[PDB]
Design an enzyme around this catalytic site. Structure first.
Site, PDB file in Angstrom:
ATOM      1  N   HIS A 100     -27.455  20.854 -61.482  1.00 22.25           N
ATOM      2  CA  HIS A 100     -26.753  21.731 -60.548  1.00 22.25           C
ATOM      3  C   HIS A 100     -25.620  22.575 -61.144  1.00 22.25           C
ATOM      4  CE1 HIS A 100     -26.676  21.792 -55.864  1.00 22.25           C
ATOM      5  NE2 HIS A 100     -26.917  22.999 -56.375  1.00 22.25           N
ATOM      6  N   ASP A 123     -26.800  18.887 -50.373  1.00 24.10           N
ATOM      7  CA  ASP A 123     -26.464  17.927 -51.416  1.00 24.10           C
ATOM      8  C   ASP A 123     -25.825  16.688 -50.824  1.00 24.10           C
ATOM      9  OD1 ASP A 123     -25.230  16.826 -53.892  1.00 24.10           O
ATOM     10  OD2 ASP A 123     -25.006  18.864 -54.651  1.00 24.10           O
ATOM     11  N   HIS A 125     -23.381  15.440 -52.490  1.00 22.30           N
ATOM     12  CA  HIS A 125     -22.076  15.708 -53.080  1.00 22.30           C
ATOM     13  C   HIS A 125     -21.560  17.142 -52.855  1.00 22.30           C
ATOM     14  CE1 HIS A 125     -24.648  12.928 -55.455  1.00 22.30           C
ATOM     15  NE2 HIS A 125     -23.605  12.097 -55.436  1.00 22.30           N
ATOM     16  N   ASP A 127     -19.822  18.876 -55.202  1.00 17.74           N
ATOM     17  CA  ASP A 127     -19.874  19.640 -56.481  1.00 17.74           C
ATOM     18  C   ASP A 127     -18.699  20.624 -56.648  1.00 17.74           C
ATOM     19  OD1 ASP A 127     -22.197  18.265 -56.814  1.00 17.74           O
ATOM     20  OD2 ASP A 127     -23.533  19.976 -56.825  1.00 17.74           O
ATOM     21  N   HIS A 140     -22.017  19.548 -63.597  1.00 20.28           N
ATOM     22  CA  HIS A 140     -22.918  19.606 -62.437  1.00 20.28           C
ATOM     23  C   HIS A 140     -22.188  19.153 -61.154  1.00 20.28           C
ATOM     24  CE1 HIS A 140     -24.697  15.259 -62.342  1.00 20.28           C
ATOM     25  NE2 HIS A 140     -23.430  15.221 -62.763  1.00 20.28           N
ATOM     26  N   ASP A 231     -29.987  20.582 -53.796  1.00 17.25           N
ATOM     27  CA  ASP A 231     -29.942  19.453 -54.720  1.00 17.25           C
ATOM     28  C   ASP A 231     -30.828  18.414 -54.074  1.00 17.25           C
ATOM     29  OD1 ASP A 231     -29.378  17.013 -56.136  1.00 17.25           O
ATOM     30  OD2 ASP A 231     -27.297  17.552 -56.500  1.00 17.25           O
ATOM     31  N   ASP A 233     -30.990  15.383 -54.377  1.00 10.58           N
ATOM     32  CA  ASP A 233     -30.293  14.142 -53.974  1.00 10.58           C
ATOM     33  C   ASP A 233     -29.622  14.268 -52.571  1.00 10.58           C
ATOM     34  OD1 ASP A 233     -27.563  15.028 -54.395  1.00 10.58           O
ATOM     35  OD2 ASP A 233     -27.470  14.136 -56.412  1.00 10.58           O
ATOM     36  N   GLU A 276     -31.881  19.258 -59.756  1.00  5.42           N
ATOM     37  CA  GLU A 276     -31.707  17.850 -60.082  1.00  5.42           C
ATOM     38  C   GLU A 276     -32.987  16.996 -60.014  1.00  5.42           C
ATOM     39  OE1 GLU A 276     -29.069  16.626 -61.632  1.00  5.42           O
ATOM     40  OE2 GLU A 276     -27.431  18.022 -61.151  1.00  5.42           O
TER      41      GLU A 276
HETATM   42  N1  QR4 Z   1     -18.318  13.689 -57.807  1.00  2.14           N
HETATM   43  C1  QR4 Z   1     -19.218  13.195 -58.861  1.00  2.14           C
HETATM   44  C2  QR4 Z   1     -18.799  13.932 -60.167  1.00  2.14           C
HETATM   45  O1  QR4 Z   1     -19.500  13.605 -61.217  1.00  2.14           O
HETATM   46  O2  QR4 Z   1     -17.924  14.771 -60.184  1.00  2.14           O
HETATM   47  C3  QR4 Z   1     -20.744  13.461 -58.493  1.00  2.14           C
HETATM   48  C4  QR4 Z   1     -21.447  14.688 -59.092  1.00  2.14           C
HETATM   49  C5  QR4 Z   1     -22.835  14.954 -58.533  1.00  2.14           C
HETATM   50  C6  QR4 Z   1     -23.446  16.252 -59.047  1.00  2.14           C
HETATM   51  B1  QR4 Z   1     -24.737  16.727 -58.320  1.00  2.14           B
HETATM   52  O3  QR4 Z   1     -25.955  15.888 -58.363  1.00  2.14           O
HETATM   53  O4  QR4 Z   1     -24.628  16.953 -56.890  1.00  2.14           O
HETATM   54  O5  QR4 Z   1     -25.105  18.013 -58.931  1.00  2.14           O
HETATM   55  C7  QR4 Z   1     -21.449  12.178 -58.950  1.00  2.14           C
HETATM   56  C8  QR4 Z   1     -20.493  11.090 -58.505  1.00  2.14           C
HETATM   57  N2  QR4 Z   1     -20.662   9.771 -59.219  1.00  2.14           N
HETATM   58  C9  QR4 Z   1     -19.379   9.471 -59.933  1.00  2.14           C
HETATM   59  C10 QR4 Z   1     -18.785  10.840 -60.199  1.00  2.14           C
HETATM   60  C11 QR4 Z   1     -19.111  11.613 -58.912  1.00  2.14           C
HETATM   61 MN    MN Z   2     -25.382  19.003 -56.609  1.00  2.00          MN
HETATM   62 MN    MN Z   3     -25.824  15.818 -55.706  1.00  2.00          MN
END
Ligand code: QR4
Ligand code: MN
Ligand code: MN
Ligand code: QR4
Ligand code: QR4
Ligand code: MN
Ligand code: MN
Ligand code: MN
Ligand code: MN
Lengths: 319, 319, 318
Positions: A100, A123, A125, A127, A140, A231, A233, A276
């Site tokens: 992402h 999503d 999250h 992001d 991401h 995304d 997920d 993703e």
């Molecule tokens: N807020 C997160 C980050 O990595 O900044 C998320 C990022 C997700 C990114 B995605 O898949 O939506 O692109 C994943 C979480 N797990 C611990 C860190 C957390």
């Molecule tokens: Mn994402």
């Molecule tokens: Mn995500």
């Protein structure tokens, strides 16, 4: 073919926006599943712009905790140029990810041709971490921060991102499916007053009201181009398990289909990201195939495939 | 017992409306699961009319691409006679299928005693292909076309079906659960203005509004007998996997029970079909048991079993 | 910490309200999953009152068909004393079960300090059988009957329960999740006019309307304390399979979280029961872990964990 079924496919085999290997194979597995053929089967005008060549950047030192900054910045810079080219050719850009982080380039490029665009971000999250609020250091989980005008002055000079100009205001984005948001991200979301439908709002309102409210919030004032950044997920891991950051209690297969059917019906889809999908992360070969099939179904719904059925403008009872 | 709990069970072990062997065992597996005993446990007056023999028709060449026409037509003709007999005895006909081509006979024979009946068709598919729009040539995908008055002049002279007279108008049928409709079928559905709730409408409205709208659409003008034709593939394959044409994103176990609980409550259920249970299509013995148990639960809900509970008109605190 | 995040934890390792062994391990598995630590991580003031010792009652003869009456009655008597102590200390009582017969003690104890409490009962079952309407004789299916004022004169003199005083009226309880109710229980529910949202009402209205109606039914006239008695079998067995009385077509993971997020937001949660987690009943080690993780997620949502996100009152951008 119709504007809403005229597509420019861009493969973005990039993984350095996160630490899990395999997400770069997303374009390959989506193509092997017959995405392009299935789109042509539903009266789509499909032009394949191929897979963007992502050249290795060997001396990519971290910016503080932020990993592979030059690689992530360059991949998005390249994608921005390609998306802008697709948009100039009067086609809906379809980005096959890839992690992402690539949304930086996808949205930036799309805004160059359509600056009035509205974003729907599906999503688990937000992001929206900045290079300073991030605890993971994975880009991401930061693409929304580089894109928002209100976060100008809060994004430090990260190597590989000097080309970035914030192209969207906090009022031009709607989140759907949120369920794992960092404290820093929740602070940003609330302080900027961004519109969102976390899983709590989806449970409360139903996906019907969610879509009615999303589309009215973005299109009520005037019709404008829609960019859907999807995304995988965002959907529950029971449907898309072959992904890097799965979170339980996600959007159902039906809800995913409903969101995309409603977006198609507006006739305003202008940009799409299918991100993703990681085929190295399925616990069984079936978990990979399930994720790929779900991602293909979401994509087909974006370009007109409807659960009630579809028919050509001919008399089927009198051929 | 009450009219809504007075039942005549007809086993229709027939498979030639489709190509997959095993559906003919549906009546056997539903009986072995204790359907009759469970119905008697919930104050039902149950009479078992047995399993229809359906003598072999060895010479049954195809009508164009339409497979086993004389076998399908004759099975439906005999079922029509049997259902009419059950209806004359003041009982709700309960047809244990068997493939869904049997609905031709089930609805035709029910209309002979109650010509004012309304149909609720629970299925992933419309089953409205004509012998000329069909691409598979399987008659289980065509029963609705033989029954509709508006399709008179569009059904050719198929061997085994000269006895058929269209008995329902497009306005007296409601579909619930649709998600895999052929182009020809979608053309028919839209041109005839048939009321339907595909998975898109179920997602938008919720099953509560779907049932409120279905019952008001069919019973608003006046009370009339209800015929529920339940194809187990209307429910998601996570609940009914042992079926011939399964489609993902289906009605939940809860939605299936809600539909049937609401139909029972009207006191107007007059005919019921439990179709497409195929006990040879379980990938594991548990998938068969799961399908059979789900089919049994749907059936019990049709005859009064309520999730909130049931009690006899006695004082439970002073026996 | 805020009153809504100030907790007194009580372990209740008791299984004799039902015949399936293992539910006494519920407090152990919930503690091992890091429940206390996770609560402290979300700005909760947590005080651990430990696990209650339940002494063996060797000659505990049945009252008619009703099994282990003195053991069940004594366990609830002890729990009532402990919950009342936690409530007096200005904390939300958090009971880790253990079978649902313990709700007799948890609600009784809570009503001693807050007699105006309102009960939200999340379960596939009503648990309202009396010692005379019960067919199984398992007390975990009879706690509501011992607690209701309208059922006074209807409950016989059961050994171990002479300490019990009905503390809730039929109008002060709301059921959510009902899908397996005995005829005698359905008769009670209808004749007493108890408010309920069976799976039929959840399907009809949606969990949003269910919660809007539940909270308005209890809090409409004025704010009052809320007791949430959560039976893990209220959720579908695809989320909580390691339980003694599972019933298909249950509340989803999302619906369970939605109910608890809405209760937290009122700031009126005063008592909580997390019941019927049985780690001996998982078909695979993953089935146990899934049940425990789901139960932990429900508990965290009761004390503020929100799917939209949470943040401390500081400037994250500076
Ligand atoms: N807020 C997160 C980050 O990595 O900044 C998320 C990022 C997700 C990114 B995605 O898949 O939506 O692109 C994943 C979480 N797990 C611990 C860190 C957390
Ligand atoms: Mn994402
Ligand atoms: Mn995500
Ligand atoms: N509309 C169909 C047909 O056979 O005509 C379906 C028939 C549905 C039968 B049933 O299960 O509703 O009774 C099966 C589909 N596969 C390709 C052709 C499609
Ligand atoms: N009403 C019951 C009882 O034992 O009284 C239920 C008791 C469940 C209690 B519990 O899990 O909600 O706390 C289990 C059912 N199976 C046959 C008897 C029925
Ligand atoms: Mn059918
Ligand atoms: Mn079907
Ligand atoms: Mn219980
Ligand atoms: Mn229960």
């Amino acid at each position: 073919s119709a504007k809403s079924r005229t597509i420019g496919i861009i493969g973005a085999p990039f993984s350095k926006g996160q630490p899990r290997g395999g997400v770069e194979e997303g374009p390959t597995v989506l193509r092997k599943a017959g995405l392009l053929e299935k789109l042509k089967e539903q009266e789509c005008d499909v032009k394949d712009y191929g897979d963007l060549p992502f050249a290795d950047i060997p001396n990519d030192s971290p910016f503080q905790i932020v990993k592979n900054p030059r690689s992530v910045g360059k991949a998005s810079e390249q994608l921005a140029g390609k998306v802008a080219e697709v948009k100039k050719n009067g086609r809906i850009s379809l980005v096959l990810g890839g992690d992402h982080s690539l949304a930086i380039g996808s949205i930036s490029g799309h805004a160059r041709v359509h600056p009035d665009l509205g974003v729907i971000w599906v999503d688990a999250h937000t992001d929206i971490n900045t290079p300073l609020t991030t605890t993971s250091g994975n880009l991401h989980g930061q693409p929304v921060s580089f894109l928002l005008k209100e976060l100008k002055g809060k994004i430090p000079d990260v190597p590989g991102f000097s080309w970035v100009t914030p192209c969207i205001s906090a009022k031009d984005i709607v989140y759907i499916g949120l369920r794992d948001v960092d404290p820093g991200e929740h602070y940003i979301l609330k302080t900027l007053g961004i519109k969102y439908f976390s899983m709590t709002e989806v449970d409360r309102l139903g996906i019907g009201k969610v879509m009615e409210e999303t589309l009215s919030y973005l299109l009520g004032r005037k019709k404008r181009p829609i960019h859907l950044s999807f995304d995988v997920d965002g959907l529950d891991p029971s449907f898309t398990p072959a992904t890097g950051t799965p979170v339980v209690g996600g959007l159902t297969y039906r809800e995913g289909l409903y969101i995309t059917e409603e977006i198609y019906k507006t006739g305003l889809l202008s940009g799409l990201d299918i991100m993703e999908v990681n085929p190295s992360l399925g616990k069984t070969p079936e978990e990979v195939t399930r994720t790929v099939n779900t991602a293909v179904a979401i994509t087909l719904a974006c370009f007109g495939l409807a659960r009630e059925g579809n028919h050509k403008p001919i008399d089927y009872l009198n051929p």
